[PDB]
Amino acid sequence: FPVVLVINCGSSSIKFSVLDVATCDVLMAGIADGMNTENAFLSINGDKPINLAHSNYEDALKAIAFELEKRDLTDSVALIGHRIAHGGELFTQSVIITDEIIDNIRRVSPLAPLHNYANLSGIDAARHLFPAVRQVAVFDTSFHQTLAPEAYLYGLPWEYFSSLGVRRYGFHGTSHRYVSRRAYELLDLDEKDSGLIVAHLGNGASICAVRNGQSVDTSMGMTPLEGLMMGTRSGDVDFGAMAWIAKETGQTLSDLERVVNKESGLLGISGLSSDLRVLEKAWHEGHERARLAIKTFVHRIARHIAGHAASLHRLDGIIFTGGIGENSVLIRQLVIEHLGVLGLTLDVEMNKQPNSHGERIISANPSQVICAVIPTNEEKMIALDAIHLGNVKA
Amino acid sequence: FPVVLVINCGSSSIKFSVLDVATCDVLMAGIADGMNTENAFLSINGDKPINLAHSNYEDALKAIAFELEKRDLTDSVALIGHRIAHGGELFTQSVIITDEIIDNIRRVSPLAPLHNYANLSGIDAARHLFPAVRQVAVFDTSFHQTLAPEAYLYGLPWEYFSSLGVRRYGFHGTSHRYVSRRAYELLDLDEKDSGLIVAHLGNGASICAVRNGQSVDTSMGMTPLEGLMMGTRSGDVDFGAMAWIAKETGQTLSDLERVVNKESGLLGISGLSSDLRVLEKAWHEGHERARLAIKTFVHRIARHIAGHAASLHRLDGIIFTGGIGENSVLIRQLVIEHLGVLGLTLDVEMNKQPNSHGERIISANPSQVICAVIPTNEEKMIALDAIHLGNVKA
Ligand SMILES: Nc1ncnc2c1ncn2[C@@H]1O[C@H](COP(=O)(O)OP(=O)(O)OP(=O)(O)OP(=O)(O)O)[C@@H](O)[C@H]1O
Numbered sequence: 144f145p146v147v148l149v150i151n152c153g154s155s156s157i158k159f160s161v162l163d164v165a166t167c168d169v170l171m172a173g174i175a176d177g178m179n180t181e182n183a184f185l186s187i188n189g190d191k192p193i194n195l196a197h198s199n200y201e202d203a204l205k206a207i208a209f210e211l212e213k214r215d216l217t218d219s220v221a222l223i224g225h226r227i228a229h230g231g232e233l234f235t236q237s238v239i240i241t242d243e244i245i246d247n248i249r250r251v252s253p254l255a256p257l258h259n260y261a262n263l264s265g266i267d268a269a270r271h272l273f274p275a276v277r278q279v280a281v282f283d284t285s286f287h288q289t290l291a292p293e294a295y296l297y298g299l300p301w302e303y304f305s306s307l308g309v310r311r312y313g314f315h316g317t318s319h320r321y322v323s324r325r326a327y328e329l330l331d332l333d334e335k336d337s338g339l340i341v342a343h344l345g346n347g348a349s350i351c352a353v354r355n356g357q358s359v360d361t362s363m364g365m366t367p368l369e370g371l372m373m374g375t376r377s378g379d380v381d382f383g384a385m386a387w388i389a390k391e392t393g394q395t396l397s398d399l400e401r402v403v404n405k406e407s408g409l410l411g412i413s414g415l416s417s418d419l420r421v422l423e424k425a426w427h428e429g430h431e432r433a434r435l436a437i438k439t440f441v442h443r444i445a446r447h448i449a450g451h452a453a454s455l456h457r458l459d460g461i462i463f464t465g466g467i468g469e470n471s472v473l474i475r476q477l478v479i480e481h482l483g484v485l486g487l488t489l490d491v492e493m494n495k496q497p498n499s500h501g502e503r504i505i506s507a508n509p510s511q512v513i514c515a516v517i518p519t520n521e522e523k524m525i526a527l528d529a530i531h532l533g534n535v536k537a
Numbered sequence: 538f539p540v541v542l543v544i545n546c547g548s549s550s551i552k553f554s555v556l557d558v559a560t561c562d563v564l565m566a567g568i569a570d571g572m573n574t575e576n577a578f579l580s581i582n583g584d585k586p587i588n589l590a591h592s593n594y595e596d597a598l599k600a601i602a603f604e605l606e607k608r609d610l611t612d613s614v615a616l617i618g619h620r621i622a623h624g625g626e627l628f629t630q631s632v633i634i635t636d637e638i639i640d641n642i643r644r645v646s647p648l649a650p651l652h653n654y655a656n657l658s659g660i661d662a663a664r665h666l667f668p669a670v671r672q673v674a675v676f677d678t679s680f681h682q683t684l685a686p687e688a689y690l691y692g693l694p695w696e697y698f699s700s701l702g703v704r705r706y707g708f709h710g711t712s713h714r715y716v717s718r719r720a721y722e723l724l725d726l727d728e729k730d731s732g733l734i735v736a737h738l739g740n741g742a743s744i745c746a747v748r749n750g751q752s753v754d755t756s757m758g759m760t761p762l763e764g765l766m767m768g769t770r771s772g773d774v775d776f777g778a779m780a781w782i783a784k785e786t787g788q789t790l791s792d793l794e795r796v797v798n799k800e801s802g803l804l805g806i807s808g809l810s811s812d813l814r815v816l817e818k819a820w821h822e823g824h825e826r827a828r829l830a831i832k833t834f835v836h837r838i839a840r841h842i843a844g845h846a847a848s849l850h851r852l853d854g855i856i857f858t859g860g861i862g863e864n865s866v867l868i869r870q871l872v873i874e875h876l877g878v879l880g881l882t883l884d885v886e887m888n889k890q891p892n893s894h895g896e897r898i899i900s901a902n903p904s905q906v907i908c909a910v911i912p913t914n915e916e917k918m919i920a921l922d923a924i925h926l927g928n929v930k931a
């Protein structure tokens with residue numbers, strides 16, 4: 144039984160998973176943290192954090208390579224899937240990695256320079272170590288390329304779009320794609336005749352409108368910065384306000400960029416934590432700024448869910464997914480109550496059930512729109528694209 | 538029969554109106570354009586553009602003062618209403634202008650420096666020329682102060698709000714207030730038990746959610762830049778995208794600020810006109826970029842209308858107002874069709890009727906939500922606040 148090797152190269156780390164081709168089961172998982180720094184270490188299943196100090200993207204990938212031999216599954220690796228940050232306008236679906244693709248990934252790289260170079264470092268590393276192994280590129284953006292111009296164009300002058308490529312792209316595509324597919328089965332809906340709203344809520348948070356199997360509107364923009372307020376990200380922010388802060392504090396464009404990325408969001412308002420689970424406890428203990436941060440977070444989600452419903456002809460399902468979506472009973476209820484206008488009644492027996500209950504409906508019967516939780520599995524989706532492309536001949 | 542003098546001092550001009558106290562009828566209207574420049578001129582009813590070259594805010598206001606004597610109504614002026622751009626956090630309602638207010642208007646001025654100084658120039662000018670005449674300040678923001686923190690807080694660090702005042706304020710309040718009040722009569726709704734969405738669409742465009750008589754959510758942010766795409770304004774724009782353009786073209790924060798204000802929006806996408814009526818004709822003549830600009834404009838409105846509905850417990854009415862709202866048959870229909878999810882059926886007989894038909898329902902009977910057009914009258918609303926405050930003793 145062959146296996147798939149999934150790779151997600153961030154700027155700071157390398158996340159991986161080894162899934163069985165036969166069943167799509169997780170056989171192994173690990174992280175290679177502190178990349179390009181003075182100290183780099185690898186942790187698999189939380190066995191023993193082995194530290195090969197000062198190691199690059201290739202060295203750490205070679206470290207996982209040793210560990211695949213150790214656990215005697217190295218020669219069973221039939222496919223390698225790469226998560227790519229930004230596919231630009233060029234990628235509509237997942238592709239088998241060839242020289243062409245590598246050039247095309249480098250071509251769109253300027254749009255997400257930090258994250259994409261890491262992906263390219265990982266593709267080369269995996270190519271080097273695994274030679275006759277078919278490799279697949281899977282893009283966070285591809286699912287959102289079905290959007291019409293009215294949905295992806297900015298109010299900015301046409302020039303910026305045509306010559307520089309400034310448009311809405313959207314992220315969490317793989318998750319949005321996976322969850323949406325799964326919702327067709329659980330809700331027993333006809334894909335080609337449906338309208339779903341998906342709320343991927345974790346550290347990064349985005350909404351997506353899925354009309355008849357296609358993505359028609361999405362929360363995030365050119366960068367992951369637009370839309371919902373997140374763990375450390377501000378989300379929807381008035382540009383006037385942003386430029387006003389610049390003049391008032393004498394901060395540079397780069398300064399503000401760091402603030403909206405790493406200092407804002409839930410962390411920003413509460414001034415306590417970026418982690419939602421911590422902020423839930425602080426509210427319980429009478430922390431107002433944590434309570435505000437959640438109420439606001441809830442509010443911007445409800446606003447964007449309702450907002451995204453406009454791009455549907457009919458609203459059949461609202462689906463929660465991600466770290467917060469799948470696990471936070473509070474946030475799910477608060478968001479839904481904020482959407483009472485859409486004629487939703489919640490089943491609090493079903494909303495109380497923990498994530499172990501997996502794919503679950505949480506709406507009551509008098510509800511005009513079905514609510515459900517569907518655990519996202521991006522590794523499984525990257526595997527399936529790879530398997531399909533594994534049967535292809537290129 | 539006494540009269541009210543309404544004044545709106547922009548950076549470039551002074552708009553005025555003389556309304557009869559007895560009936561709220563327009564007796565006179567005019568503009569003082571090209572302010573502080575080498576050439577300043579006054580036009581009343583389009584009679585004869587008289588030009589007093591190189592004149593300040595006081596000189597032009599003194600020119601209108603002469604014309605009020607000429608038409609023998611100078612001594613009938615019982616009240617003077619001033620439109621203020623930014624009331625900050627200090628003003629919840631309209632106030633009788635006193636020294637205190639002047640200080641308080643100067644205090645919040647930094648938030649909208651260009652527009653507010655003009656208002657203050659106008660208040661002093663009117664005070665100078667009209668001494669024993671009661672004067673009222675009316676704020677574009679005041680109506681939106683009912684918003685809860687969850688609705689007005691940004692994802693930015695708490696510090697920016699508490700020490701600098703960076704929050705959502707919202708604009709077109711007077712219009713939103715007037716139109717909403719009027720909708721209670723036309724739709725025969727109980728104010729204290731209602732949920733309305735108001736779409737003020739002109740050169741500046743903003744949405745407002747009115748729950749039980751109060752404003753609970755609004756499109757624009759700290760500055761008029763946030764929210765809907767407008768004539769020359771971009772609207773909702775990803776900050777990542779904005780900072781990316783800065784690095785790519787080497788433009789300053791001020792450069793980009795000019796672009797999103799005066800070069801973007803409908804003007805931006807079409808690359809033809811900021812005027813909607815012109816762009817409607819271009820589409821008819823097969824202009825794609827004008828057609829896109831409209832389709833996008835329609836899209837962001839439908840998105841924000843649906844989005845704002847979340848802050849209501851029930852959706853009773855969607856009301857169109859402003860230059861575009863009251864007059865464009867196309868945009869009204871396109872927006873409503875984009876909101877089919879909300880269960881709206883349109884009466885196209887009623888939607889075809891021109892603005893002469895005034896306050897009019899445009900929705901069909903099977904429609905779950907009532908649609909209507911209500912012409913905004915900001916001068917009438919400024920008059921009514923002034924009349925009420927005229928009966929007060931301060
Ligand atoms: N039991 C729980 N109750 C409440 N909140 C919980 C509970 N368990 C986790 N969280 C919150 O979920 C957030 C992390 O979500 P994630 O999906 O694991 O974040 P990720 O970073 O791994 O995935 P993303 O999908 O965000 O990746 P990117 O967007 O960054 O690419 C925590 O805030 C936690 O409080």
Ligand SMILES: Nc1ncnc2c1ncn2[C@@H]1O[C@H](COP(=O)(O)OP(=O)(O)OP(=O)(O)OP(=O)(O)O)[C@@H](O)[C@H]1O
Nearest residue numbers: 738739740741742811812813814815859860861864865
């Ligand atoms: N008959 C018409 N059909 C289609 N469009 C029309 C028709 N008549 C006018 N417009 C469009 O309306 C816009 C101007 O609206 P406005 O309300 O007069 O603009 P304003 O500047 O006077 O008022 P605002 O409410 O925008 O003020 P601020 O926000 O700037 O404070 C034009 O685009 C025209 O095409």
